[PDB]
Each structure stands twice: as C-alpha cells, then as structure tokens.
C-alpha cells in the first residue's frame, strides 16, 4: 500500500462511510424504493422498504 500515504486511506474510508450512510438516509426519503415484494400480486399494497 506504500504509494498512497495513509492520509488518503483514512479520508477515502470516511468518504465511503459517509456516502453509503447518506445514500441509506435518502433511501428513507426515496419515494419509489418501496416496492411491495413480488408485485405479481399487487392486490396487497404492503409498503415495504429497500436499501
């Protein structure tokens, strides 16, 4: 791992953590990520999550 100074490793790790977390948070505010699993039977509009 020598070429990259340990600084960038920790910054990239924190950036990955933050982007994944904010993506998950947006999933809560995502309108369409709810997808009532197995929509072959949309008879039941079971509001179910994703992401």
């Amino acid at each position: 791992l020598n070429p990259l100074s340990p600084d960038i490793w920790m910054y990239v790790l924190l950036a990955c953590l933050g982007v994944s977390c904010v993506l998950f948070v947006i999933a809560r505010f995502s309108p369409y990520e709810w997808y009532n699993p197995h929509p072959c039977n949309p008879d039941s509009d079971v509001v179910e999550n994703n992401f």
Binding site: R28, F29, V47, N49
Partner: peptide, 9 residues
C-alpha cells in the same frame, strides 16, 4: 404523516 410513516419503520 408521510414523514412519520417512513420514519417509524
């Protein structure tokens, strides 16, 4: 109400 719906889960 929608905020509560999608937060309380």
């Amino acid at each position: 109400s929608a905020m509560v719906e999608e937060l309380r889960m």
